[PDB]
Enzyme design. Structure first.
Site, PDB file in Angstrom:
ATOM      1  CG  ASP A 125      -1.914   1.194   1.154  1.00 33.78           C
ATOM      2  OD1 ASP A 125      -2.170   1.708   0.046  1.00 33.78           O
ATOM      3  OD2 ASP A 125      -2.422   1.593   2.222  1.00 33.78           O
ATOM      4  CE  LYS A 576     -12.694  20.820 -12.143  1.00 33.56           C
ATOM      5  NZ  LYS A 576     -14.000  21.198 -12.746  1.00 33.56           N
ATOM      6  NE  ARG A 639     -16.957  15.323 -27.575  1.00 37.44           N
ATOM      7  CZ  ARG A 639     -17.865  14.445 -27.985  1.00 37.44           C
ATOM      8  NH1 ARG A 639     -19.153  14.747 -28.045  1.00 37.44           N
ATOM      9  NH2 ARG A 639     -17.470  13.230 -28.352  1.00 37.44           N
ATOM     10  NE  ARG A 713     -25.032   6.586 -39.629  1.00 36.66           N
ATOM     11  CZ  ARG A 713     -24.685   6.523 -38.351  1.00 36.66           C
ATOM     12  NH1 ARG A 713     -25.417   5.868 -37.464  1.00 36.66           N
ATOM     13  NH2 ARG A 713     -23.572   7.131 -37.950  1.00 36.66           N
ATOM     14  CG  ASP A 848     -16.171  -3.608 -26.441  1.00 39.25           C
ATOM     15  OD1 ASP A 848     -16.717  -4.657 -26.048  1.00 39.25           O
ATOM     16  OD2 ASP A 848     -16.537  -2.472 -26.079  1.00 39.25           O
TER      17      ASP A 848
END
Lengths: 941, 372, 358
Positions: A125, A576, A639, A713, A848
DNA sequence: CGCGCGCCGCAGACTGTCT
DNA sequence: AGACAGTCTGCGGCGCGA
């Protein structure tokens, strides 16, 4: 040599499976199942024949060869775990050493400095100070023989770099000095990935042959909580079923120890000096903090002792254990471009938000007028605000140029007299009042003057606030948006006022027209559209491109605000976590000779790795959970910061070789229903949609649907993806919401009339229902997943809840099957890389998807190995259940991506900043079916 | 139109009525007013801080207005090219560096039709030029970096940053470059150009040997490519002044008529004044505050020498059109309790605040306006 | 002498050693000034602006073009200033006593037989009532002499003299005593209505200003100083066995020099960058002397930084990674002091302020 | 949809003041 | 000793991904 198809494209040749069990002679049932409602007629397009010389199989039979591989992989680590399981544990030392490096405590607490803990098995730890969080701060470990502690240079006070090369603790010895386990080490911990992130040798590009076990992973596999189950567990510290509370626990170490060990409760520090404390306070409270960390380590050791046999009995197959060990080794290399990307993303975010901030502060300031004449009362937008005011609570000719101006200081000290007035008075208001003169609504938007991060104007004014819509926003004719209980209508899922302004803006009691101007001050507003859950921020962007939605200043201001908000939302949410990622930069000596000898090795450049800190089984489906890497946005132009994946770049002389399973969940469900129905691979109709299905014709899964609106679609695919999993009726009404939003009873009748992928009382499924196998697995209580066996959870097992959280149970099957597929892929890849000299054993952890860091000189060879795994893995899914053979369509990956960076497609540029040429990243040129010409042996071509 | 008459009422654009769009853009205006000069100085200081001072390798250079045979200069680039060899020693041949300058450049202006100007009617424009010597390998990276940085600087201090735009371009030789424009009400006007000369000028002016022009970009020494970033400030002032004004909107009913210039480049920050009260004992306090603010570095409009007082409301309009951040009023109540009034730019609300610590408040307002 | 060689080597004067000479420096026919010279010019111009323009509330900036638009490069800023006198009269509310200041380049012929020499000059034109014109002349002469003597290491070299030309009634001229002899650095002239109403012929009802009513005619006071000769004088004043070149703290182009001694790790570059950013955020110009090839020498580095007139030399060593102490070497006292990191910025700010005050 | 992980705005309840 | 500022702290709402 032969087509060997049997009316469907079947995998050519059979090397490992052998020839037996040819046909059950029950083909007629599948024949007239496929005859019903069409779909029987098919082109049956062939595929090129593939002839491959597979490596020799030790087992001599599938499902035993993989067992042998997993056993050989996990033998030393299981032996180390068993050695750690025995009880020869001494008590904790009385006083810790407080010394640099590793120190060992044997009997009677004597502390001996040791270069490295010479232990095959450890429970580890690390506790980390939040200030300069990259460094590990302190850590402890425990072995069957003795205790160990590590401090990280706390005796000496200095200023340290942010590179964090030598900061992490050393845990691996040299290969020349190893125990006769031997060269194999296992580290157990609660959230052990966090501790792995602070290990010095875990960042080397070459393999480390040390494995890690996560207590949270074992607990989640054995007994975890999903969605409401977790929240309800917090609520009680589900209808007519709460037995699962007594066998379920949250992932925290304290509750896990309470559930499993059941000893005295663990206590956390109220000071939390590591999280909310400085470094000096940690130095003063070193003994108490180290004692608490050692107590936590003891708790995790006890939990591991109680977990290992239970985990092994609930997961008997060694493949699951080997895949769990392999998943906690993800590398994710990076270079100096990571810091540049972080800086660029932060700067772009600041630019975009500053633009919107200024645009909003302008409206706020211009609206700060209208108070002099009390014009806000007659305004149709800002009359709801309070507009409060609070008191402060307290010639002569030229006369010459003159001289002796040195006495100017007199007036200077006259100013000091007013400074004296600070003391002689002003005591009636000593606390600095915050903008008494401005209106209260404007008062709230400004930062406090005493704030160190203070900026002029109403800086605390963004979108999605309760005042920004009132500043400019307007819908149709009706101006007001009271939002006192319900906002101004809209959204997807339903559920004094100056009337003179209402008449001027025109261009029980009832309303002739549902839209238009708002009427009366009663906030009931007839309950039109969604009332409470309307934010008026994002969903209206395509509805705003007409006269129904208009901003105040201009027609492009509102669209600009929405577009910029969409651009910076992802970074606002994730900066962050992304900027706080731990990066350790390797020095020149640590890099192998291949990297430095390779060309295009950017000298004076930083290379490192970011270990994802991923929980191996954070989700009750044993699926890997990591907030950032596993759940991150694919590269997009609009974005900001969406290029996060693209910055995972292999070092010089290295590349990423990976692939993606084509419709993994859909194929798994299809093959499971196929096996439940009959023994051939195309028996189920859904199977025939998944296997040999083309969007050009009606053979596609989504195209054959009714498609009332008529779109394949989007309309037909969301319907199919929602009918599987939840299968909700509100999801059926969402189709009426999308289009033809009229005649709701007709919508209900049409939905009831749709029997496709639906079952009636006459219980089990009938006709095209793959759900039968999922429901059968969900109510068994034996090792549930069909592939190699894995129980779901003692919390979600039957007899704990009768009929509750059924959707989670049925999705667990297809989800847990995908995890087993991933484990099989990892085991096969490890075997292939070990048996044949294919350096670059490291992998990258994705769901995946599996990417592997390989040398360039074996870039294609490794790819071939991946394809081989993609064969041998699916054959396992064939070997289990009744499908003795495998179809040719899914036998191989569609394309194996060889690249220098991590991205969904190699023929794709992020263009988030519209300059993708800033970093050197060429295309990947993936290989599909062209790699079979070579052989997996090194001495080829 | 109305903006032009406002500029001239408050001595910003210049003098006399000859100024127009063509004369202002071409540099044939008679000259800028005192507020125009202050705005130009502030803009030049901001450009210097963003380009020269904050960058370790960018250095100041001086280019003579005329060159020996001389017909003055049309750009500052030539001086930087002549100083390349001399300044390479200063940077000890660390090749990726630059030379920055701000100065007046002369361009011919062709009025055409009657009164053919030909060489006459010389137009003067204030040009800020950075000549950046870069390694050939990373020339495009630095091109994009400088384009982004200059676009950020122009979008900084911009009330509507969307009006500033950028475009790509190719030279007659095929060399890459970028051009920044400001969207004036009539149309987009060029305000800055980045060009990638590609070391042609170095070999042109130094054809003897290349060994003396070699600069180190690392272990190897190469001949640098040249990146000329040339922006003009007079059009920059025009762009900022037009942007600060309103359009040329629905149910506005607001006619403040205020030049909302950015605090960092505003010509005058705070205007002092005297309230209704006894003469003397207030002029001394105002003089002391004036001296304090000048010692700080904040430009102050005195305001307490005027004795009309314009009913206390028209002078607020005068200061708003003058682009003044704050209006400080010292009244007779200041001697009882040291509290002054602050109208402030925008948000025409009276602010009661103690005369003490106004130093800190104004310094923080000026410094923190740059960031957000 | 050695002054020109030192300024050429340390990039105060730009050009070749033989080309610079001495007479070409007095006139504008020289290649220019190095980056250090340019920064010294900028500091001198800024301080002139602070002492003349902002402090005197009446003085306003003015913009004069470099060329006459009709019938030529300007030779003085006075004529450029006088065109906007009428317009700036409205700004000051027609109150006669007020000034207009500008710092700009002016071109002169030098006897390619004839050369064009450009020199930057700071000019203020003060319009005053005629009766107080002489008093304002004396006031401006005293203030200009004080300003020129403020930064002088030897203020006795800056002197004043009376010219009393036949055109203007009174005038003064300031001289600096260079080693060869006195050179004019600033001129003071008093002119009446001459060349004021000439540019505005006809009625004087539009050009006169009010001072005690009666709308008295203006009288102009032209004060014109040569900033290039100012830097020449200050550089010659700084020089005096060591090549120290003690420039004034407020006028020195580079305040402090950042460097590294022993280079144990790369973190020295990081802390140097942090200190660079901290110093530059507060307006202190620092020469990035670090990131230099292998630290050729230390005493030679101090000699170089002295010849560049750097006030302080800051050396960062291994001990700086234990405490904030770095070596701070003073240009004038050549003393070395251990000094913490956090106190450097405030210490330099207070040092500059104390130098400015006295 | 079925989950995994994050954030940001707003009404109430403690101290924590202060005159 | 009797009114109003800070913090949490619990609500509702995003966004985003295999």
């Amino acid at each position: 040599l032969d087509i060997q198809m049997l009316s469907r494209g079947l995998h050519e040749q059979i090397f490992g499976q052998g020839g037996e069990m040819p046909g059950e002679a029950a083909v007629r049932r599948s024949v007239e199942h496929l005859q019903k409602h069409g779909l029987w007629g098919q082109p049956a397009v062939p595929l090129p024949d593939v002839e491959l010389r597979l490596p020799p199989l030790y087992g001599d039979n599938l499902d035993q060869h993989f067992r042998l591989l997993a056993q050989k992989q996990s033998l030393p680590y299981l032996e180390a775990a068993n050695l750690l399981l025995q009880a020869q544990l001494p008590p904790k030392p009385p006083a810790w050493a407080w010394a640099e490096g590793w120190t060992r405590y044997g009997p009677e607490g004597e502390a001996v400095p040791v270069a490295i803990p010479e232990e095959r098995a450890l429970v580890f730890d690390v506790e980390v100070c939040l200030a300069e969080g990259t460094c590990p701060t302190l850590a402890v470990a425990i072995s069957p023989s003795a205790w160990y502690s590590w401090c990280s240079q706390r005796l000496v006070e200095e200023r340290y770099s942010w590179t964090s090369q030598l900061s992490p603790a050393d845990l691996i010895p040299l290969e020349v000095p190893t125990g006769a386990d031997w060269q194999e080490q296992l580290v157990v911990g609660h959230n052990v990935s966090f501790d792995r992130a602070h290990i010095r040798e875990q960042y080397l590009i070459q393999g480390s042959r040390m494995r890690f076990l996560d207590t949270m992973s074992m607990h989640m596999a054995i007994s975890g909580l999903s969605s409401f189950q977790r929240s309800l567990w917090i609520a009680a510290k589900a209808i007519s079923s709460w037995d699962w509370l007594d066998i379920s626990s949250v992932n925290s170490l304290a509750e896990v120890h309470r559930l499993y060990v059941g000893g005295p409760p663990l206590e956390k520090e109220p000071r939390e000096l590591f999280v909310k404390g400085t470094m000096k306070d940690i130095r003063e409270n070193f003994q108490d903090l180290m004692q608490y960390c050692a107590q936590d380590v003891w708790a995790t050791h006890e939990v591991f002792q109680q977990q290992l046999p239970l985990f092994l009995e609930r997961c008997p197959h060694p493949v699951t254990l080997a895949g769990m060990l392999e998943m906690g080794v993800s590398y994710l290399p990076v270079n100096q471009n990571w810091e540049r990307y972080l800086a660029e993303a932060q700067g772009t975010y600041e630019e975009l938000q500053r633009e919107m901030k200024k645009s909003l502060m302008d409206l706020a300031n211009d609206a700060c007028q209208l108070l002099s004449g009390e014009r806000y009362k007659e305004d149709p937008w800002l009359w709801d605000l309070e507009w409060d005011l609070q008191e402060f609570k307290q010639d002569q000719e030229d006369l010459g140029p003159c001289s002796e101006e040195e006495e100017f200081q007199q007036d200077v000290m006259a100013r000091a007299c007013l400074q004296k007035l600070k003391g002689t008075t002003e005591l009636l208001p000593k606390r600095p009042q915050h903008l008494p003169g401005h209106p209260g609504w404007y008062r709230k938007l400004c930062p406090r003057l005493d704030d160190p991060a203070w900026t002029p104007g109403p800086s605390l004014l963004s979108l999605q606030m309760r005042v920004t819509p009132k500043l400019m926003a307007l819908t149709w004719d009706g101006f007001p948006l009271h939002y006192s209980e319900r906002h101004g209508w809209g959204y997807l899922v339903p559920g004094v006022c100056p009337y003179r302004a209402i008449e001027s803006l025109y261009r029980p009691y009832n309303d002739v027209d549902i839209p238009g101007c708002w009427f009366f001050k009663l906030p009931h507003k007839d309950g039109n559209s969604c009332n409470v859950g309307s934010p008026f921020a994002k969903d209206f962007l395509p509805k705003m491109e007409d006269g129904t939605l208009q901003a105040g200043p201009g027609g492009a201001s509102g669209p600009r605000a929405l577009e910029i908000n969409k651009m910076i939302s992802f970074w606002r949410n994730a900066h962050k976590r992304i900027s706080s990622q731990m990066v350790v930069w390797l020095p020149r000596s640590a890099l192998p000779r291949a990297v430095i000898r390779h060309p295009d090795y950017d000298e004076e450049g930083l290379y490192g790795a970011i270990l994802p800190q991923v929980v191996t089984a954070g989700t009750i489906t044993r699926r890997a959970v990591e907030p950032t890497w596993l759940t991150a946005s694919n590269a997009r132009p609009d974005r900001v910061g969406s290029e996060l994946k693209a910055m995972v770049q292999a070092p010089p002389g290295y590349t990423l070789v990976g692939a993606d399973v084509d419709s993994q969940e859909l194929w798994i469900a299809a093959v499971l229903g196929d096996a439940h129905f009959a023994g051939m691979h195309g028996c189920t109709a859904f199977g025939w949609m998944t296997l040999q299905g083309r969007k050009s014709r009606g053979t596609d899964l989504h195209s054959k649907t009714a498609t009332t609106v008529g779109i394949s679609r989007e309309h037909a695919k969301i319907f199919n993806y929602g009918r599987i999993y939840g299968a909700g009726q509100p999801f059926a009404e969402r189709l009426l919401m999308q289009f033809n939003h009229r005649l709701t009873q007709q919508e209900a009748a049409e939905k009831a009339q749709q029997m496709y992928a639906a079952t009636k009382g006459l219980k089990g499924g009938t006709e095209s229902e793959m759900f039968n196998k999922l429901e059968s697995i969900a109510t068994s209580d034996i090792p549930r997943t069909p592939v190699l066996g894995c129980c779901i959870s003692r919390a979600l097992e039957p007899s704990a809840v009768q009929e509750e959280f059924m959707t989670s149970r049925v999705n667990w099957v297809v989800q847990s099957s995908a995890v087993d597929y991933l484990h099989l892929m990892l085991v096969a890849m490890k075997w292939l890389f070990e048996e044949f000299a294919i350096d670059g054993r490291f992998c990258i952890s994705i769901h995946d998807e599996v990417r592997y860091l390989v040398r360039e000189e074996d870039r294609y060879r490794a790819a071939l190995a991946l394809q081989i795994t993609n064969l041998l893995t699916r054959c396992m899914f064939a070997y289990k259940l009744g499908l003795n053979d495998l179809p040719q369509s899914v036998a191989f990956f569609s394309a194996v991506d060889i690249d220098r960076c991590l991205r969904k497609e190699v023929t794709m540029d992020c263009k988030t900043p519209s300059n993708p040429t800033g970093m050197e990243r060429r295309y990947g040129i993936p290989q599909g079916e062209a790699l079979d010409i070579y052989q997996i042996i090194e001495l080829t071509k | 139109a109305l903006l032009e008459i406002c500029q001239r009422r408050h001595f910003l654009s210049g003098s006399k009525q000859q100024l127009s769009r063509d004369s202002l853009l071409s540099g044939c205006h008679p000259g800028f007013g005192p507020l125009g000069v202050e705005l130009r100085k502030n803009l030049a200081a901001e450009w210097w801080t963003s380009v020269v001072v904050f960058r370790e390798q960018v250095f100041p250079v001086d280019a003579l207005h005329h060159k020996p045979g001389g017909k003055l200069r049309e750009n500052l680039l030539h001086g930087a090219l002549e100083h390349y060899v001399n300044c390479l020693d200063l940077v000890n041949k660390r090749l990726p560096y630059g030379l920055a300058q701000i100065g007046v450049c002369f361009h011919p202006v062709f009025d055409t039709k009657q009164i053919r100007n030909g060489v006459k009617s010389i137009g003067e424009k204030t040009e800020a030029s950075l000549v950046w010597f870069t390694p050939p390998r990373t020339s495009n990276q630095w091109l994009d970096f400088w384009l982004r940085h200059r676009l950020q600087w122009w979008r900084k201090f911009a009330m509507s940053p969307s009006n500033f735009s950028s475009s790509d371009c190719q030279d007659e030789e095929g060399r890459k470059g970028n051009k920044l424009y400001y969207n004036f009400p009539w149309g987009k006007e060029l305000i800055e150009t980045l060009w990638n000369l590609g070391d042609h000028e170095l070999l042109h002016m130094y054809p003897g040997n290349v060994s003396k022009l070699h600069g180190r970009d690392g272990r190897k020494n190469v001949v640098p490519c040249v990146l000329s970033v040339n922006g003009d400030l007079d059009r920059g002032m025009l762009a900022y002044l037009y942007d600060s004004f309103q359009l040329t909107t629905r149910k506005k009913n607001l006619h403040r008529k205020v030049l909302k210039l950015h605090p960092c480049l505003a010509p005058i920050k705070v205007a002092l004044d005297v309230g209704r009260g006894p003469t003397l004992e207030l002029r001394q306090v105002c003089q002391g505050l004036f001296n304090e603010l000048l010692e700080n570095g904040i430009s102050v409009w005195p305001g307490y020498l005027e004795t009309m007082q314009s009913s206390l409301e028209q002078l607020y309009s005068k200061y708003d059109e003058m682009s003044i951040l704050f209006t400080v009023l010292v009244t007779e109540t200041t001697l009882e309790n040291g509290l002054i009034h602050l109208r402030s730019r925008d948000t025409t609300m009276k602010e009661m605040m103690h005369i003490s610590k106004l130093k800190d408040f104004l310094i923080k307002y000026i410094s923190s306006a740059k960031n957000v």
